[PDB]
């Protein structure tokens, strides 16, 4: 699901990505059809630029934090950092060093809230390169003729089944995280040439790569399935199977 | 067209002209002879920055 969304009807999955060069916001939202001069309001009201920045930049940004608030309710953000901020706030008048140690855990909480509330962005260029390498998909789909009908990608809530992923049953990791950092979604594709359609379901999880402490890929497709549908032919392609991918690599269990 | 350059704050002379001949006549004897790049806006800044294992991004 897309968290950052305004009343603009076009380009929903690109609204947070596109950086417009506008000085202020357009008078009216992008029109879906040709309208009449009286359909819009000339000389918009006073303080209109400040109103737009609130309902087009601030409000959709707060709806994101509210939509994904279930990912920040961990014991570290809720109890540790605020309690650490209060212990030094009682001594803020003694010296400047206490003001800093009382505000740092709050700026740290915002950073974790900021990063955790963003929409999960995978490397889509790695994905399209992966499917365009499969002959069963390129048989019906090509980049010059493919179009997106629907897109959904959101984190999975809470801890998962503690038999397929026993890693998340760690009280030290749970103290910092209340979610899993995994995401699940699909891709509705269509080809204007062959008329084919397919639902590209996929699951992702962060993995370690080639290093000790740093994550290798926060969104690694360990399950990638495509249910291709054509004029009268139905195919099911398995680019990445989870039963064979989970035997080689395990999640990363982000901390902080 | 002059109002379009003003209202968009494209007040760098000759930015939107493919051949800014007026820009070459003024720079015939200038140091670091150069003309403004095509469609250069006085507000855009494409500056980047990176941190490497060495200092100063090297």
């Amino acid at each position: 699901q897309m968290g950052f969304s305004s009343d603009n009807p076009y380009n929903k999955r690109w609204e947070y990505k596109w950086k417009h060069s506008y000085y202020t916001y357009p008078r009216d939202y992008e029109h879906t059809e040709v309208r009449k001069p009286q359909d819009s309001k000339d000389v918009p009201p006073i303080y209109f630029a400040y109103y737009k920045d609130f309902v087009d930049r601030w409000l959709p940004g707060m709806n994101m934090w509210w939509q994904r608030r279930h990912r920040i309710f961990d014991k570290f953000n809720v109890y540790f950092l605020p309690g650490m901020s209060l212990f030094f706030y009682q001594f803020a008048d003694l010296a400047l060093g206490f003001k800093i140690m009382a505000a740092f855990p709050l700026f740290l909480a915002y950073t974790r809230i900021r990063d955790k509330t963003l929409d999960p962005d995978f490397k889509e260029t790695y994905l399209r390169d992966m499917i365009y390498q499969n002959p069963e998909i390129t048989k019906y789909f090509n980049e010059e003729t493919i179009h997106v009908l629907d897109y959904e990608f959101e984190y999975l809530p809470g801890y998962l089944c503690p038999e397929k992923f026993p890693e998340y049953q760690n009280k030290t990791w749970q103290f910092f995280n209340t979610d899993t950092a995994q995401a699940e979604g699909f891709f509705k594709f269509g080809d204007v040439e062959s008329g084919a359609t397919m639902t590209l379901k996929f699951k992702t999880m962060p993995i370690p790569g080639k290093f000790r402490y740093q994550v290798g890929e926060p969104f690694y497709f360990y399950d990638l399935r495509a249910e291709i549908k054509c004029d009268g032919v139905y195919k099911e392609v398995v680019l990445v199977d989870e039963k064979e991918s989970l035997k080689k690599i395990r999640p990363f269990l982000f901390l902080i | 067209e002059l109002e379009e350059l003003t209202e968009t704050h494209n007040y760098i002379p000759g930015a939107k002209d493919d051949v800014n001949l007026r820009g070459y006549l003024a720079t015939q004897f200038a140091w670091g002879k150069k003309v403004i790049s095509f469609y250069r806006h006085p507000a855009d800044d494409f500056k980047c920055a990176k941190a490497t294992k060495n200092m100063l991004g090297r």
């Binding site: 003694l94 400047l96 060093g97 206490f98 800093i100 140690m101 740092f104 | -």
Partner: protein
Amino acid sequence: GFGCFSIINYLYGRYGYIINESSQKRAAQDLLDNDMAADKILFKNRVGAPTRPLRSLDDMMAFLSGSATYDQLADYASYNHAMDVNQDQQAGLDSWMSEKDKNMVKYYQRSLGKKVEGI
């Protein structure tokens, strides 16, 4: 770092005497014990100035280990008139000094704002 350095520097101001107050009391009396010993072994001319600190090895150490030795000698050398007199003594003009002339430096120290007794 700024938070910790500003904190420990505060604790060292509020607290700290718990472990260093002894070293200050020791140096306080020591700074007075060595000064009293300097006045015992030091050449003072008709004014209270240690003009011969290098007379012997024991005088060099007593002059350096003292606190007021630097001032009694610096104030004597910083007094224009006192050095004009000495410049005349070197030429052969000298005489006896009264109790008021002997304290020409104490008057000079008082003028600068010093706390000097024995006028």
